[PDB]
């Protein structure tokens, strides 16, 4: 059958932490966009438009993780583009379809399959035009050719759900121009909220083409991750960093263990990199590479212990035998 | 707009099949656009002035007949291909567009 | 004087060399102060907190003193807005140049080497003219001001109101080492 | 059984001078990968990715080496690529599943070990992704590569030709996928992400240090060299190769069994003359060959340059029995001390 | 003055002394006054950013001006990284020869028919008021006036009680005598 708004949220809540309104909001935009796909696609009924969603929040903040969730839960194919890897000079055209061929790459180059996927767009707030009218005119309903498997292949993406996404960083003092009394004053505001309350007239002056806003009805926010949330992040989620490594350690005989303090720590130097959850495997690779070389060596060695020391220090980890 | 002359009017293009550009090691297929009917369409936003300026011209000084001074909607039901040349477009490309809606 | 023009790499934006020092947010107080040219730092400093609250403005002094409400108008600027203000003396910072030096941010107030600053009681304010009654007035206010720079410049150097009462009676000249010692500044820079 | 990591890199100093903590992330990487194929019971929620390995550094550093050396030790089916013989499938070149061919030749065939063998690819950076095309029918040698790789590196099903003259469906999804090459642009991707400086007093103002900016380096800076997003994601691990430094460079002058040092003292050894450096002779030469931005490349160049006037004349010279090159020899226009 | 306009190729329109700039040219044309002073400090800080470690050309044709503004130049030539040099134009004299023996030891030159003038300051001020202000005016004349030679002595690699003799008065000098005197290393010709 298909996943009501509740139960998409409920399975994608195991994978992504936090962004609640984000959440809900693609879970109805999805819901809706896959029963409009169920509907009497003939006769005198109604013919059914789709509603794209916009999300906005910085980067790591999981717009990527969302989209894929998504795709994951509702059985269709998925695939990630990048609106700065489309060049303003050149064949706009002739690359802004091959995202096509990517998605049905994806999906056996099963057209029955790809008409109905999921495509995320990264970084759309980066070609702030001619990047922009392609997208614009791949978004709405247009029949695309693409070279075949091994004859070309006919795609109508009309029925593709579209998910754009970017950290619109000067995007808040657009808005602060027009909801604050001012910048500059002595008295006058000085400095996700106000992104909740984004008006099409701010992403026209960030630089959004017009029409580009009228596809994409649903605005969804994302809010930066705090160090609390870093930290499940870390241990909650099906792919954990520390439920892999502690993996890594468990097909040998030696348990992974970390203290709580370097957890937040950990979660803390993350989040000094203006990076979100995409810095924390790095950081933990680096604490964990003093041992996944040495356990190799180490023998009678039965756990580990990760301290706040490791993270923040030149300390190795604590080998108890 | 100049490559749009001989194809809007009849021409016999050379299309590439569907696969690549349009190179000179390039197979091709004729196409004979005379019978093509072609739809030109945009939202031509500073037309308005041009239709202003043309229409409400007036004039300068105590000497001068100054011209009264009706939105987007009322000058556009007016224009005229002095407006289209004045805009931009060039009169070889608006005398084969002979219809204007 | 002809203000050089000077290209930032970004494409290019051409700046004189005043506005591309503001740009990383240095301010001059060059010359005396007036209303025209200390409106011109309190706007820069207003500008340079929007841009970005957190980081230190840069105040270089190099000023004969002037005006004590045009100074005050930059003081209580300096002092309202978020960012440290840090204050540097080039050449000299004489009267309320040398108020506006010590008016820095504790641990941020430095002066070059061979730099000269001068502390002194305020002379007029405003001339002294008309009736008795109106002298009698502004004499107190010339009093009320002397005992607030007093205050002030007390507070800035960590020393009591006596200290400052007996030093800025007449024209205190202090090398850098000096002013440090005194309290003025906190830092003589070298390299 | 499957060699340590401390076995790997212990085996490795043995052919690759410095580098030290490339070695130290490759033979971790590899001993991961081969105990999780051993250990499939990774198929737990936990999505262990394919670690494989992206290999950037300077020309000279010792990429090529520290292929060949884990290749040799290993004992597993190990391919080296380049990607300039990479072509997209329907144009002239070799296409990205002559690589998978060869790793089935390397193995008499046996489709088992090879798809769970090692695969190096060298001068990746040269396929990377560029405008439309001076050069324009189509950029073959470019992004369509970057793709049929990727369509390998993450789990899919090649069909390659027989052992013979029938296809054999080789399952990619366990081998591992190791690229490299000098990304000449990174530095200055890196420099306009940092490099911001200051004005001022109280600012901090300030040859590229190539080095601490490739152990900066972020996927995204490699995007803006060229490569696909998808496939950056599917290279987690980045080694870095360090710029050889005066001590590298004079072990590898002295040490390797087929050293500069000793590639010369056999070259003369045709003759009857013996060859001999003097230890300042040689630091200066590395120091030389490090001013040359080449590597142990341009070590070669500087031993060559400096015995040109000598081999020019050992023919001629006779009763000559030994030349020493001493640091005059080098620093100074000089000729080594002849000993009749 | 109309100050001519140049093309650089790279095009980009300069004034002739923006140009300059660009090649790391600062002149120090006339007195030496507050706003003089800080535009040369102003250039010299705007070409440490550029460049840390290339030389500063400093074009000096000064008769002298005020000495706590050659002061603001004088701490900022020594306090940037990269090495001033000084070139002594038409004439450098008081403060201008100040400057003008600042400049980095063995980077200090002058044209072959230049005039290098050397002296005690005058006022700094006005000594008016009451005696108690003359005294303080004339003791801090003094410490400026021993501050001088000492420095002006440590540029020429001289005793400072050399200086205190030669600057008594105005001392002239050609270019020749101010190198043999050790306020310049160079002259240049050609
Ligand atoms: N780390 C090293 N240890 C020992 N020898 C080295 C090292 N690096 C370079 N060399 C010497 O340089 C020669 C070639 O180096 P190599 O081919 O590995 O460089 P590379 O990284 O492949 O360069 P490029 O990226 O230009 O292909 C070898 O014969 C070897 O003797
Ligand atoms: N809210 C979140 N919950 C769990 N993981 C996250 C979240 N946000 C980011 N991550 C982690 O960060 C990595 C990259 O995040 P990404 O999808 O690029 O975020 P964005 O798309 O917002 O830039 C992923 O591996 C993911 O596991
Ligand atoms: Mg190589």
Same mark, same amino acid.
């Given at each position: 059958?298909?996943?009501t708004?509740?139960?998409?949220?409920?399975?994608?809540?195991?994978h992504?932490?936090?962004?609640?309104?984000? /959440?809900?909001?693609?879970?109805?935009?999805?819901?809706?966009?896959?029963?409009?796909?169920?509907h009497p696609?003939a006769?005198?009924?109604?013919?059914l438009?789709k509603?794209?969603?916009l999300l906005?929040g910085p980067?790591?903040?999981?717009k990527?993780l969302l989209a894929?969730s998504?795709?994951?839960?509702?059985?269709?194919?998925?695939?990630?583009?990048?609106?700065?890897?489309?060049?303003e000079?050149?064949?706009?055209? *002739?690359?802004?379809?091959?995202?096509?061929? /990517?998605?049905l790459?994806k999906?056996?180059f099963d057209?029955?399959?790809?008409?109905?996927?999921?495509?995320?767009?990264?970084?759309?707030?980066?070609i702030?035009?001619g990047?922009?009218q392609?997208?614009?005119?791949?978004?709405?309903?247009?029949?695309a050719?693409?070279?075949?498997?091994? *004859?070309? #292949?006919n795609?109508?993406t009309?029925n593709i759900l579209?998910?754009?996404?970017?950290?619109?960083?000067?995007?808040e003092?657009v808005?602060?121009?027009?909801?604050?009394?001012?910048?500059?004053?002595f008295?006058?505001?000085?400095?996700?909220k @106000?992104?909740?309350?984004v008006?099409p007239?701010?992403?026209?002056?960030?630089?959004?083409?017009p029409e580009?806003?009228?596809?994409?009805?649903?605005i969804?926010?994302?809010?930066?991750?705090?160090?609390?949330?870093?930290?499940?992040?870390?241990?909650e989620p099906?792919?954990?960093?520390?439920?892999?490594?502690?993996?890594?350690?468990?097909? +040998?005989?030696?348990?992974?263990?970390? +203290? +709580?303090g370097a957890?937040?720590?950990?979660?803390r130097?993350?989040?000094?990199?203006?990076?979100?959850?995409?810095?924390?495997?790095?950081?933990?690779?680096?604490?964990?590479l003093?041992?996944?070389?040495?356990?190799?060596?180490?023998?009678?060695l039965?756990?580990v212990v990760?301290?706040?020391?490791?993270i *923040?220090?030149g300390?190795?980890?604590? %080998?108890?035998? | 707009?100049?490559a749009?002359?001989?194809?809007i009017?009849?021409?016999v293009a &050379?299309?590439?099949?569907?696969?690549?550009?349009?190179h000179?090691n390039?197979?091709?297929i004729?196409?004979?656009?005379?019978?093509?009917?072609? #739809?030109?369409?945009?939202?031509?936003?500073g037309?308005?002035?041009?239709?202003?300026?043309?229409?409400?011209?007036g004039?300068?000084?105590?000497?001068?007949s100054?011209? &009264?001074?009706?939105?987007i909607?009322?000058?556009?039901?007016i224009?005229?291909?002095?407006?289209?040349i004045?805009?931009?477009?060039?009169?070889?490309?608006?005398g084969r567009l002979?219809?204007?809606? | 004087?002809?203000?050089?023009?000077? #290209?930032?790499?970004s494409?290019?934006?051409?700046?004189? #060399?005043?506005?591309?020092?503001?740009? +990383?947010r240095?301010?001059?107080l060059?010359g005396?102060?007036?209303?025209?040219?200390?409106?011109?730092?309190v706007?820069?400093?207003?500008?340079?907190?929007?841009?970005?609250?957190? /980081?230190?403005?840069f105040?270089?002094?190099?000023?004969?003193?002037?005006?004590?409400?045009?100074?005050?108008?930059?003081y209580?600027?300096?002092?309202?807005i978020?960012?440290?203000?840090?204050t540097?003396?080039?050449?000299?910072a004489?009267?309320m140049?040398?108020?506006?030096?010590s008016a820095?941010? /504790?641990?941020?107030?430095?002066?070059?080497?061979?730099?000269?600053?001068?502390?002194?009681?305020?002379?007029? &304010?405003?001339?002294?003219?008309?009736?008795? &009654?109106?002298?009698?007035?502004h004499?107190?206010?010339?009093?009320?001001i002397?005992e607030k720079?007093?205050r002030?410049?007390?507070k800035?150097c960590?020393?009591?109101?006596?200290? %400052?009462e007996?030093?800025?009676?007449?024209?205190?000249?202090?090398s850098?080492?000096?002013?440090?010692?005194?309290?003025l500044?906190?830092?003589? @820079?070298?390299?």
């Amino acid at each position: 059958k298909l996943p009501t708004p509740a139960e998409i949220v409920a399975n994608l809540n195991d994978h992504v932490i936090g962004q609640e309104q984000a /959440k809900k909001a693609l879970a109805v935009s999805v819901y809706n966009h896959y029963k409009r796909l169920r509907h009497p696609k003939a006769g005198a009924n109604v013919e059914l438009s789709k509603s794209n969603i916009l999300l906005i929040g910085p980067t790591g903040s999981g717009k990527t993780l969302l989209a894929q969730s998504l795709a994951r839960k509702l059985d269709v194919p998925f695939v990630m583009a990048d609106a700065t890897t489309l060049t303003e000079a050149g064949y706009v055209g *002739e690359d802004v379809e091959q995202i096509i061929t /990517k998605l049905l790459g994806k999906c056996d180059f099963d057209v029955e399959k790809a008409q109905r996927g999921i495509v995320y767009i990264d970084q759309i707030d980066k070609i702030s035009e001619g990047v922009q009218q392609a997208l614009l005119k791949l978004i709405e309903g247009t029949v695309a050719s693409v070279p075949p498997q091994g *004859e070309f #292949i006919n795609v109508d993406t009309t029925n593709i759900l579209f998910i754009c996404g970017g950290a619109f960083a000067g995007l808040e003092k657009v808005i602060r121009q027009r909801t604050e009394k001012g910048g500059i004053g002595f008295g006058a505001s000085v400095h996700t909220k @106000l992104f909740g309350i984004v008006e099409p007239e701010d992403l026209i002056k960030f630089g959004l083409i017009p029409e580009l806003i009228g596809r994409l009805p649903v605005i969804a926010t994302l809010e930066i991750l705090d160090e609390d949330a870093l930290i499940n992040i870390l241990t909650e989620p099906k792919n954990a960093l520390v439920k892999q490594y502690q993996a890594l350690f468990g097909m +040998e005989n030696v348990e992974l263990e970390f +203290e +709580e303090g370097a957890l937040r720590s950990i979660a803390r130097q993350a989040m000094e990199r203006k990076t979100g959850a995409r810095g924390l495997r790095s950081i933990v690779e680096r604490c964990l590479l003093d041992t996944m070389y040495r356990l190799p060596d180490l023998k009678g060695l039965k756990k580990v212990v990760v301290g706040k020391a490791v993270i *923040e220090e030149g300390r190795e980890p604590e %080998l108890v035998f | 707009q100049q490559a749009l002359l001989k194809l809007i009017e009849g021409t016999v293009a &050379s299309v590439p099949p569907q696969g690549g550009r349009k190179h000179p090691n390039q197979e091709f297929i004729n196409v004979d656009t005379t019978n093509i009917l072609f #739809i030109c369409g945009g939202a031509f936003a500073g037309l308005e002035k041009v239709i202003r300026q043309r229409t409400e011209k007036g004039g300068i000084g105590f000497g001068a007949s100054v011209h &009264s001074k009706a939105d987007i909607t009322k000058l556009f039901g007016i224009v005229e291909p002095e407006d289209l040349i004045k805009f931009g477009l060039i009169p070889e490309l608006i005398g084969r567009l002979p219809v204007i809606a | 004087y002809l203000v050089p023009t000077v #290209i930032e790499q970004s494409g290019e934006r051409a700046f004189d #060399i005043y506005s591309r020092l503001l740009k +990383e947010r240095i301010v001059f107080l060059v010359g005396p102060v007036t209303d025209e040219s200390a409106n011109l730092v309190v706007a820069q400093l207003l500008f340079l907190e929007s841009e970005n609250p957190d /980081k230190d403005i840069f105040f270089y002094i190099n000023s004969p003193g002037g005006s004590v409400t045009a100074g005050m108008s930059i003081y209580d600027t300096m002092n309202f807005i978020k960012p440290d203000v840090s204050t540097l003396c080039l050449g000299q910072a004489a009267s309320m140049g040398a108020f506006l030096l010590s008016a820095g941010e /504790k641990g941020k107030r430095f002066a070059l080497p061979n730099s000269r600053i001068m502390i002194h009681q305020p002379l007029i &304010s405003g001339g002294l003219g008309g009736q008795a &009654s109106d002298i009698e007035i502004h004499a107190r206010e010339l009093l009320k001001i002397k005992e607030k720079l007093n205050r002030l410049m007390a507070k800035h150097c960590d020393r009591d109101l006596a200290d %400052l009462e007996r030093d800025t009676d007449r024209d205190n000249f202090m090398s850098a080492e000096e002013a440090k010692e005194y309290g003025l500044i906190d830092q003589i @820079l070298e390299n």
